[PDB]
Design a protein around this ligand. Sequence first.
Ligand SMILES: C/C(=N/O)c1cccc(C(C)(C)NC(=O)Nc2ccc(Cl)c(-c3nc(C(F)(F)F)cs3)c2)c1
Ligand SMILES: C/C(=N/O)c1cccc(C(C)(C)NC(=O)Nc2ccc(Cl)c(-c3nc(C(F)(F)F)cs3)c2)c1
Ligand SMILES: C/C(=N/O)c1cccc(C(C)(C)NC(=O)Nc2ccc(Cl)c(-c3nc(C(F)(F)F)cs3)c2)c1
Ligand SMILES: C/C(=N\O)c1cccc(C(C)(C)NC(=O)Nc2ccc(Cl)c(-c3nc(C(F)(F)F)cs3)c2)c1
Ligand SMILES: O=c1[nH]cnc2c1ncn2[C@@H]1O[C@H](COP(=O)(O)O)[C@@H](O)[C@H]1O
Ligand SMILES: O=c1[nH]cnc2c1ncn2[C@@H]1O[C@H](COP(=O)(O)O)[C@@H](O)[C@H]1O
Ligand SMILES: O=c1[nH]cnc2c1ncn2[C@@H]1O[C@H](COP(=O)(O)O)[C@@H](O)[C@H]1O
Ligand SMILES: O=c1[nH]cnc2c1ncn2[C@@H]1O[C@H](COP(=O)(O)O)[C@@H](O)[C@H]1O
Ligand SMILES: [K+]
Ligand SMILES: [K+]
Ligand SMILES: [K+]
Ligand SMILES: [K+]
Lengths: 356, 355, 368, 358
Amino acid sequence: AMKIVKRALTFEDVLLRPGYSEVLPKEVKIHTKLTKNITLNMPLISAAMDTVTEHRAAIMMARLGGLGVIHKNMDIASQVREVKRVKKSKEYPDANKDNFGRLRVGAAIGVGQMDRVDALVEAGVDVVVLDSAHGHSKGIIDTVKAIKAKYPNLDLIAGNIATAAAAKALCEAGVDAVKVGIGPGSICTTRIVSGVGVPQISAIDECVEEANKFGVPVIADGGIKYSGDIAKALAVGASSVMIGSLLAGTDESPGELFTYQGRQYKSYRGMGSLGAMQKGSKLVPEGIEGRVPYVGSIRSVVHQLLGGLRSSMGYVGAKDIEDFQKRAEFVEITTAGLKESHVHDVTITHEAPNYK
Amino acid sequence: AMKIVKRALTFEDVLLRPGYSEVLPKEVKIHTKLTKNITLNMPLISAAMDTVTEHRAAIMMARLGGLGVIHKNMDIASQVREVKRVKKSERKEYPDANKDNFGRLRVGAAIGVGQMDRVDALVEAGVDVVVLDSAHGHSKGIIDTVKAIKAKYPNLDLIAGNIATAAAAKALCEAGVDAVKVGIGPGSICTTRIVSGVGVPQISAIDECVEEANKFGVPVIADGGIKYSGDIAKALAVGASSVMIGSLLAGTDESPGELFTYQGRQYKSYRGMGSLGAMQKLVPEGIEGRVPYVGSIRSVVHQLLGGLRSSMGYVGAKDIEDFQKRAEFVEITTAGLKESHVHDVTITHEAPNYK
Amino acid sequence: AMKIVKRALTFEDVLLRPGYSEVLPKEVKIHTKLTKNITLNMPLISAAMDTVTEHRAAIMMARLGGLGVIHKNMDIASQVREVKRVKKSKEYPDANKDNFGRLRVGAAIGVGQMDRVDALVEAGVDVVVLDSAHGHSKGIIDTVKAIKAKYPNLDLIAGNIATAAAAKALCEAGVDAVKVGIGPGSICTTRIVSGVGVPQISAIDECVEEANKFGVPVIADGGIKYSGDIAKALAVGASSVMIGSLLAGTDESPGELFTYQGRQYKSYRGMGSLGAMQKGSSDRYFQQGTAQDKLVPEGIEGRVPYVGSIRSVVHQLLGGLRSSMGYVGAKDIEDFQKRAEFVEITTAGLKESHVHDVTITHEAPNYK
Amino acid sequence: AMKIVKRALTFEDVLLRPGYSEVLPKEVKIHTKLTKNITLNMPLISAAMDTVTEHRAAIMMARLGGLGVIHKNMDIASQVREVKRVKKSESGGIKEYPDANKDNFGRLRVGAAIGVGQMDRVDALVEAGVDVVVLDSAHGHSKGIIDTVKAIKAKYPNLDLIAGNIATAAAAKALCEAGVDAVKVGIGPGSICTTRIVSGVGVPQISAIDECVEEANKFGVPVIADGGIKYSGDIAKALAVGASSVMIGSLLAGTDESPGELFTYQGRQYKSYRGMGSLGAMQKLVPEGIEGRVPYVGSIRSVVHQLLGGLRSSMGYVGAKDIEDFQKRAEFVEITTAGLKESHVHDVTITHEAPNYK
Ligand SMILES: C/C(=N/O)c1cccc(C(C)(C)NC(=O)Nc2ccc(Cl)c(-c3nc(C(F)(F)F)cs3)c2)c1
Ligand SMILES: C/C(=N/O)c1cccc(C(C)(C)NC(=O)Nc2ccc(Cl)c(-c3nc(C(F)(F)F)cs3)c2)c1
Ligand SMILES: C/C(=N/O)c1cccc(C(C)(C)NC(=O)Nc2ccc(Cl)c(-c3nc(C(F)(F)F)cs3)c2)c1
Ligand SMILES: C/C(=N\O)c1cccc(C(C)(C)NC(=O)Nc2ccc(Cl)c(-c3nc(C(F)(F)F)cs3)c2)c1
Ligand SMILES: O=c1[nH]cnc2c1ncn2[C@@H]1O[C@H](COP(=O)(O)O)[C@@H](O)[C@H]1O
Ligand SMILES: O=c1[nH]cnc2c1ncn2[C@@H]1O[C@H](COP(=O)(O)O)[C@@H](O)[C@H]1O
Ligand SMILES: O=c1[nH]cnc2c1ncn2[C@@H]1O[C@H](COP(=O)(O)O)[C@@H](O)[C@H]1O
Ligand SMILES: O=c1[nH]cnc2c1ncn2[C@@H]1O[C@H](COP(=O)(O)O)[C@@H](O)[C@H]1O
Ligand SMILES: [K+]
Ligand SMILES: [K+]
Ligand SMILES: [K+]
Ligand SMILES: [K+]
């Protein structure tokens, strides 16, 4: 018999149970930790993708208390210059700044790009995000040890992983956070192309339990479709959430608006798609090239997302995230329960800002 | 590791098993309790929503044996006027009308937290029951509100909600409510589970809350999620004493709101009270929509109660209390659900109780 | 503290496992029992519906070795006439005949319709089919007892039921077969309108285990979508299968062909639909002349595609069953039930079992 | 009560768990065994179907390191010539095909399908130099198939023989004891197959592979996972469970090299694809397959390239240097319906064409 280790759940499989509450949504606190040494004022990170995060999107994310990660599908000098435009940047009272009062910013790197790390460190990057399709690999782990050995005070994120053993390996190599998510991304085809993946709720749960033994936060990356998934990811034990598709159709993301059959869209594509890899430099992709509807400014998207998190926390009775994770209790639901949860049997006539 | 309390089920996960029957559907009795003191002659309540229940719909529901709950999306003066319009209304055409001791139609009215002024006026207007509703019933504000109301009006029947856990039912019952309303997330226009990730599938929520409310002798109202008459039967069979309905009544003559035509068909607006339009940035927990026009509340109510009577016939139950003692369920699969519905045949004529 | 007895399954939830086979599909025997005293030469019965079985359909079903049940949505004299047309009727070497060489036929009756039974017996009906929405009821049981006391030699089928205790009550009442099916019919809305029903595979299995203790056959009625569901139902322990929608679109069924958007259809409706009940409300109104209570139906009115002769449909259906018994290695229906082993499958396994990822260009005679 | 042996899973019910990896996808080795005595340099076989494999397709499959099985819906002389066209084909290309799958004389390897009782066909295929004969039935666990296996091995002890199709451990034990050199697994999974709908008989493919591998390993007999492969990730799943190779129909039917012509429908190009148990292939009959069409997808080489690239990527995720190491390391999770929708593309309209996903 084959080895089936567990039955794994994703976001749509579970719901949070309400608990006795003495707090209102507008009163809760949504600050969290990005790494062992960097805090966020709100728990959202924009994804490190060339249709999501350059300097315009990163500045707004940090102004709102979160973070943006500049994607690595550009030359070193262009990434340095994008980082510096963020660092050089009453209406944004929750801005996430460093000790010098400059906005905080992240930047993506790959294996074997130490010149890129050197230049981004010199540019004053706050955190380096070492990402890969398979974070639980010798190359990633050796690259972690190398960066940490040369820049001990540089906060370093590594991913992506989906198992507890992977979280142990990365924590023991010296990361300041692990990023969890193999397969959940809206534009990801890894589970279809290679057959590999772990549903995100189970992957978060498995990795948070291990990483907590090292005091290392977990970033939940991929598969967020609604503000409710942010709440579920945080309640299971993640410290922050990375989001791609829900921010790709905003004013601040790179790329221009275009019109298709009467509506406005922006491009949104995986970094492992043919289009992203060919602009960078027969390939076997693990992402698709797509479009998402234009949804206005990042500020209004972020406002609805955190408004859903605040409501969730209010339902559970939690004053802050750590209390949210302590109090959280779940129910596993069925396909019919999912249909009951969504809008059903009623035609929608007006566009809802947090539900599409 | 994360704490998963249970695997929770909703209406379409289960069906009632038939049992030996000596009763006929047209002879069973469908009276029930709304609160500890107020009875209903039939177990349906129209939702406290501004596209469902004002005075016109509240009168029909009461005339047919149930109850209408005036919504709170109006100033205090208008709600008092709506309630008094029901109490003044009224007979061989409505022999099951739900009346009070003075021969007046019974009617309820919705209130929010910290609206004592509203409670005072609806009491002096002769309201039969006050319905304290909130998105989160298991909260300090609701509990204190319950304590404050029952202290000032010990004889005013008070419904509070909405809840989805036994621990929430215990809290409200000890606070002194006369009925609890169960439903976090199941409503047709509700996005709470999607926006916040919080909710409990309705069958499990009812089951859990009734077990705890029964210890205090407190009836449970199953609010939201009803799509077919069979859902009414399952909710009552699980232990609910009554069912509150919105979408199935929004498209009727007696609901507030204009009839309008759209692409050849007539509709009425139907929207959640937590939607942007109802609350007028805001973070809504409902959506604004439309439902097809269906005719009078009377013809809808007739079909829904006919399904309930049919189900009680299949189970062999003479009344709802006997219904709850005899009821046995099976859990079914997705394939079982598809087999339960109409399948492999194109429907060509309208059926009054199936769409 | 709600009471969930079990997790119940239907046809699409299970598949038969193949077994070692020394038999060929064309060689297996598919004779079976309709009641304790009447045999069939193949296990198919056409449904007692006014869009499925009148004398034409019933003649063809008996000629092919099965049985047709004349529906009861007509006055007694009309049902008697339909029965006699069938009794009156070597291209059909498997024809299902009585001791006198006449085609066998069934006829439906309702609670308390003794006058209908007396006329059907006189017409030579071979089996009376006592039908109610709820067979596990005092009205049904009392009717079974009165018919059996008056006509001890008349074979009686009663239904429909879905539980062991229901099968026990009808068997002790004296039926010659029970008919199983609360909710599975293609045109049935009982489970949605009332919330009552049992998934059909579990209903058969539970009822067969109990009815077998009395030696009483089980008729699996409703929910058959493909020839593979006939195989599953018999493998679980049913002795025969009653079929509505797969036979409604045939030449022999009552009703005319009509065209809708370039293709032909026939009407198909539940006997508990508004349309089927309209005629009885019309008789009831003119008799008394009183404003009547509006009906609350448990079925819908629809249409099915035209599929040609009942002969070609039955041939394909029986071909699937013979193929299944070849896969299982079974020489006959009894051997089929002895050898049958199932797997429970997932929703993804159901998609894999159907045609997937390929657009169908020519429609198969046994698959849509 | 009815006997329910197990709850069976298929490809979409499971996912491979990532493991610690020191291997790059480029460096893994994907050779495997077709039978006890014939090796493949990549683990894919083209289906024995009159819309998939004749000589052109079998030539490309062998050039790329796999195998093609000439279908049996033709007279004996026609099948002999199809085999001869492959055996006499140039194996090398314009170092273009460095992984070509050859016999002892440097000729491309090829298979040919046969039915029960067609000994004259077997004799002619042997004389033509066929490398493997594929005795396929709808029901391999039958007395007719067992007897044909015994007759063929008695007359040609050194002819490699595959037999199928089966889906139970008992069926695998039967064929192995009869003397097959590989068993073919698959009752019902095929894209054009209706067996499970027409007869109610079948086993979901992942459980069927798992069950037959565990038995067939006791006899040293490889398992061929036949049918239901929709994506490259399904190939990885079948091998990880223990199958030694994978037989594919629908994904190769729309290629240049498959038999049958291109046609256009509504502005797009298609090739016909049909089950061999469909009415058209068999010419009242009772079919167990349908006739259909699949999109035109270009050359077999471009399809095979993306399929193997997905398996290589899968083995890199698991950390496996070759197939046997793949099967030792592989751990699975079982997922829900909601986990499958999260696995596919969701909430985003696909604009461009993906060579390995649609
Ligand atoms: C995130 C993501 N999701 O698919 C993705 C992003 C960009 C590119 C790719 C491509 C399409 C190029 N796909 C792989 O890179 N696939 C893959 C599969 C299996 C392994 Cl084991 C590895 C490894 N990469 C390394 C690294 F070079 F990073 F060190 C060591 S091992 C890589 C994928
Ligand atoms: C029924 C319902 N379903 O969504 C709904 C109806 C109207 C308005 C809302 C809006 C959109 C305004 N959403 C919330 O009100 N969301 C929410 C979320 C979490 C908590 Cl903890 C609370 C609370 N409100 C109170 C108060 F006392 F004020 F009533 C105490 S606790 C409230 C929701
Ligand atoms: C591959 C395949 N998949 O369906 C298929 C291919 C061609 C034809 C058929 C048809 C449509 C003809 N279907 C059966 O042949 N179905 C079936 C079902 C059960 C058994 Cl036991 C047998 C057997 N036939 C033999 C014989 F020797 F006659 F060949 C020995 S056992 C056969 C199926
Ligand atoms: C098959 C079927 N539906 O599946 C059906 C066929 C015709 C009519 C009906 C209608 C729409 C009229 N539906 C019921 O008759 N539903 C129902 C539900 C529960 C019980 Cl307990 C009873 C009973 N009626 C009797 C009587 F004596 F009156 F005939 C004895 S028991 C009846 C249904
Ligand atoms: O091409 C890819 N293949 C697989 N995953 C990707 C690819 N590109 C980006 N991702 C991941 O998907 C995340 C965004 O997912 P989303 O928020 O659901 O759209 C990113 O932050 C990456 O972790
Ligand atoms: O906007 C809202 N958000 C969530 N729930 C609502 C909202 N408005 C009304 N509800 C609930 O949904 C019920 C109606 O559900 P329905 O019967 O399925 O349409 C009401 O009685 C309320 O309990
Ligand atoms: O209107 C009805 N409501 C519920 N069940 C019905 C009705 N009319 C017929 N049936 C049942 O459904 C069977 C036909 O189901 P089918 O073969 O799936 O279409 C009949 O033989 C009856 O047992
Ligand atoms: O008509 C048939 N009925 C059932 N299975 C078939 C039929 N024809 C071919 N097959 C099987 O289906 C496989 C191809 O499945 P596919 O790769 O999913 O299209 C073949 O290799 C055969 O094993
Ligand atoms: K909802
Ligand atoms: K049905
Ligand atoms: K199939
Ligand atoms: K995905």
